[PDB]
Ligand binder design. Structure first.
Ligand code: VO4
Ligand code: VO4
Lengths: 595, 594, 50
């Protein structure tokens, strides 16, 4: 560093946009070499994504074949006195969805003269997604047809749920009206599929099956996820999950006048909440949970609990590391950010809702059922039209609730506004939770998924206190593994994770705004969006490299809602069941054989 | 249709992986014409990212020039009785970082015979990002050198923080002890830059400036953000932000034997929290927040609060819509998911920590300062080595806190474990919060950012109750627009938003784990991480398309931490101050003209 | 084939223009690899001719 050399050295502004092809970073990759690999990888993902080919998003035929759009979403639009849509008005809504243009959509007629309720984001599915699977490129199953047998059965489930809102889950085994609901529901031959939970003999046990799914763990122990019942800690604030829930004994839209005013977009009945907050203990509380939440609220609570319990510290490669722990990759930050991103901001649900299916809501179905039994000529199945057991119970509730008008067969709603003003199929809640939780299950892994949820609880009947949960004979509680790998009879994390999506998705059904299918196949769609993200990300992570040493490369091995086992590997290969596959996951019914 | 046609019709299975070039979707784009445009946009984003070029991430010089690595991070590795790293253990740590290989890193030596504290993710900055700005491709400034005049002014700010931990923010204007600090700090000619707050004259006002930043609104009204004091609603559960904070008058690593055990990676003294939970109202509370948080906790609280008040219902295109609201794009779902994704999983902070800078923590410098005044030779500025006003206070604190041992000048830590086992520069908390709130300000917009935060409150000094906040002469509370569109005097959303990132960032300093630089520059790193993601996403959004009709295309118009106005448009175009720029944002000091 | 899975299976029209990346053909080449090789060869001819 000679006298002259020193005297000659110069400097310049070091700026954010300055470029340095040479720098002293402690990194086995050069500056330009790191950028290139990141570049190639991004191209690969875009090509790979395109190679999947367009999804078979096919309308079920109802819109072309049912008279005056009675099978279609048109809430907040102009209707006649029977709630049939002004056809021009619906035509203008189609122009809106078609166009994906915000100014066109603003021309869609409202059903009241002013302050009418807004369409919830009819442009929402049309965006070109930077990463993950594009808005129109995750499959969901076709919804059942308006006139179908299985739709009647689903509407019957929702009426039953409405009738049982206030009955604590604790007393389902011994309650008379829940037994009646069960017998009634088993009488429907078309009520299978849709992750419906039955016992070993094929019946619907009131305590363990009614209103639940058959996803692994959902029908073991209590209806309510341990995660919806535990204390969680946020920023050192210790929070008991007592919520200002919906008030017992109130229903809405129990008369043609209140129902029709809603269908047109007019001001709702005042929704009312309790004064003293309570734990979740009945169908109305699940309805409340799904009404008062906001995207990842429930999933955020659940990951906070999982951290607090220190279970995620044992997951992934660092589960075997004596000297290190992950944070930004295969540690806490990664887990919590990947969880939130996992649902692709609910955009697949929006594409399916508007561009594809445009399905009517259960409160709209109940309108037709009301007017079929009393003005209209829609050939709904005899299984619901002549179901006097259910229909007598339904009209009594409406009478008590509507100020004494008899023979009204509308779906009593748990909130004054009824459903959100967007189509019924699929549920956005179901996409969101389906995804968030898939992500959690993936990072936890199958094995740690079998670990016992420590100190299980259930709410008392008033929801003022929690009681310890202890397995008995009926419960369906299997083996789990404790902090010591020491086997116990108890609830598993995997099982309790499935219940969170199950409680939220089926909560929307208790609320009166969704059929089972919207939540069940909705959760599938979310599970697929999450898996697509996980797959894209995995290969670029440091811990995805195959290296020399005791610690092996990262992979995600876990179990889907359907129960089939999936294992995700870095190089876009995955195991599905006993099958090896390559490329981007589309669903559990599909596999491009690996070779 | 015909008998024959009907009879010949065939079906096949409808699977998730079936392909349909034709389908009856109600969409102006065909199935192939949608996939292509999406493909084209991904390519374009990838090419634009490549085009920015490799960032000038340049090591300080300390690692080449300071002897026995005394300016570098090596917590949890072996040391001698003076905290000097075993040089062979440090080489192995660099092999670990260089290799980005999990199994190499499992061979970095531990400073204790068994059970030692683990390295926090030295691989974490090596990931190849699917989107946004790649892991190594966000700029942060170089950290000040070990021997710089400004590093010592920063250490001195951290020592003062330690000494002022139990003093209620509301009493800062009148407190004698708080005066001492303010005077001592203005004494450093070097204490400028780093978003340091000062009044109309170049003075550090004890009440409105000390331990604050000069970001718009930060120095107005109360220290603590409204968002960290309001109730929030999660899933129907109403939460009062009363936290089991850290216990008063209780410091850690106040002796050489405790501090060294820690630097060697051994079991920490037990950190104690209060039995009855309190609201935030002093430095030790902000330290607690910053220790007890988890990634987007604070930001989640804040967006929940903004939703509750209905302020996001007014923002963006749908703010002008009579017939529609947004949700998945330019509404609630977009806002909350983009908020969380904005920090790129903290990975920019991680690359800078390990691959670039490898900066020691404030507690490690404290140990240098201690062995300098008493066993060592590193030439630290005399403006700290001879700062007897500050040095007396420090040994008093330590002496009142260890067994009564005199003349230790170690930094008194707020938690038993000291800092996390990762380097100091920048702060992960800062990039995280820097990003989240940037997203929040972008979606809110500048105009709505000027709106009055309703019913402002502060804690009482006990931490047990809230009191209405009332503006008075010397609050620097400015103008805000109310719910009727008339101008009031009161706190703005933007100011209160900024306080959130300030509270958490500076929170880590009150904790004793970061200098100002880590937080202030780190916050700017998070801000760019966030803007880069917003830019990439914007062009592809439905409301970003140019349409005919009264409602205009979407854009993000707001103001940076540094106070410079930014406007992001769909075409990867953006306005920075008065300049029209093109391409991807790197910082407010750089613009490729349009 | 459980009761639930059977009840959930769906069909769609099988048309001349339907596309299937997986099909049960007794063929050592996959559908896409067959199209790819044919594609690469057509380009080779065009290049070779030019
Ligand atoms: O927001 V929903 O699609 O669950 O009615
Ligand atoms: O996790 V930190 O870099 O804010 O100590």
């Amino acid at each position: 560093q000679t006298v002259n050399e020193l005297a000659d050295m110069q400097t310049r502004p070091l700026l954010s946009g300055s470029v340095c092809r040479v720098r002293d970073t402690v990194d086995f990759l050069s500056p330009t070499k790191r950028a290139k690999i990141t570049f190639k990888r991004r191209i690969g993902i875009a090509v790979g994504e395109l190679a999947v080919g367009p999804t078979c998003h096919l309308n079920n035929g109802d819109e072309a074949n049912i008279p005056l759009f009675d099978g279609q979403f048109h809430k907040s639009l102009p209707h006649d006195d029977m709630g049939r849509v002004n056809p021009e008005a619906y035509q203008l809504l189609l122009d809106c969805i078609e166009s994906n243009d915000i100014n066109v959509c603003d021309q869609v007629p409202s059903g009241v003269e002013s302050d009418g309720r807004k369409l919830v984001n009819p442009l929402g599915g049309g965006g070109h997604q930077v990463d993950g699977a594009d808005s129109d490129n995750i499959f969901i199953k076709q919804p059942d047809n308006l006139l179908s047998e299985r739709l009647a059965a689903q509407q019957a489930e929702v009426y039953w749920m409405a009738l049982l809102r206030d009955i604590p889950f604790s007393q389902f085994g011994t309650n008379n009206t829940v037994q009646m609901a069960v017998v009634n529901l088993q009488g429907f031959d078309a009520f299978n599929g849709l992750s419906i939970s039955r016992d070993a003999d094929g019946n619907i046990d009131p305590m363990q099956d009614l209103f639940r799914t058959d996803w692994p763990g959902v029908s073991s122990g209590p209806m309510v996820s341990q995660f919806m019942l535990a204390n969680f800690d946020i920023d050192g604030i210790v929070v008991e999950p007592k919520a200002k829930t919906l008030v017992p004994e109130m229903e809405y839209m129990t008369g043609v006048d209140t129902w029709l005013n809603i269908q047109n977009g007019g001001p709702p009945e005042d929704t009312l909440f309790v004064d003293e907050p309570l734990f979740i203990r009945n169908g109305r509380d699940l309805a409340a949970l799904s009404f008062n939440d906001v995207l990842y609220t429930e999933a955020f609570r659940t990951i906070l609990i999982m951290f607090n319990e220190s279970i995620l510290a044992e997951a992934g490669p660092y589960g075997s590391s004596t000297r290190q722990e992950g944070f930004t990759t295969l540690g806490t930050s990664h887990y919590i950010h990947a969880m939130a991103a996992g649902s692709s901001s609910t955009r697949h649900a929006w594409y399916a809702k508007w561009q594809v299916h445009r399905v009517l809501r259960p409160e709209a179905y109940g309108g037709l059922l009301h007017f079929v039994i009393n003005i209209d000529d829609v050939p709904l199945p005899a299984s619901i039209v002549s179901n006097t057991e259910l229909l007598n119970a339904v009209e009594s509730l409406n009478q008590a609730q509507n100020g004494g008008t008899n023979q009204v067969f509308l779906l009593p709603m748990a909130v004054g506004e009824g459903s959100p003003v967007h189509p019924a199929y699929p549920s956005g809640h179901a996409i969101n939770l389906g995804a968030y939780l898939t992500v959690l299950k993936a990072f936890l892994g199958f094995e740690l998924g079998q670990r016992c949820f420590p100190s299980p609880m259930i709410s008392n009947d008033a929801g003022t206190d929690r009681i310890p949960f202890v397995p008995s004979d009926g419960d369906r509680v299997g083996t789990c593994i404790n902090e010591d790998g020491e086997e116990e009879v108890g609830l598993t994390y995997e099982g309790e994770l499935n219940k969170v999506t199950s409680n939220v998705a089926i909560g929307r059904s208790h609320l009166g705004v969704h059929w089972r299918m919207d939540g069940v196949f909705g959760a599938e769609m979310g599970e697929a969006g999450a898996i697509r993200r996980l797959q894209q990300e995995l290969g670029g992570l440091p811990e995805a490299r195959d290296t020399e040493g005791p610690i092996p490369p990262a992979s995600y091995k876990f179990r889907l809602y359907s129960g089939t086992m999936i294992e995700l590997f870095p190089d876009n290969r995955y195991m599905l069941g006993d099958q090896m596959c390559k490329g981007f996951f589309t669903g559990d019914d599909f596999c491009v054989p690996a070779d």
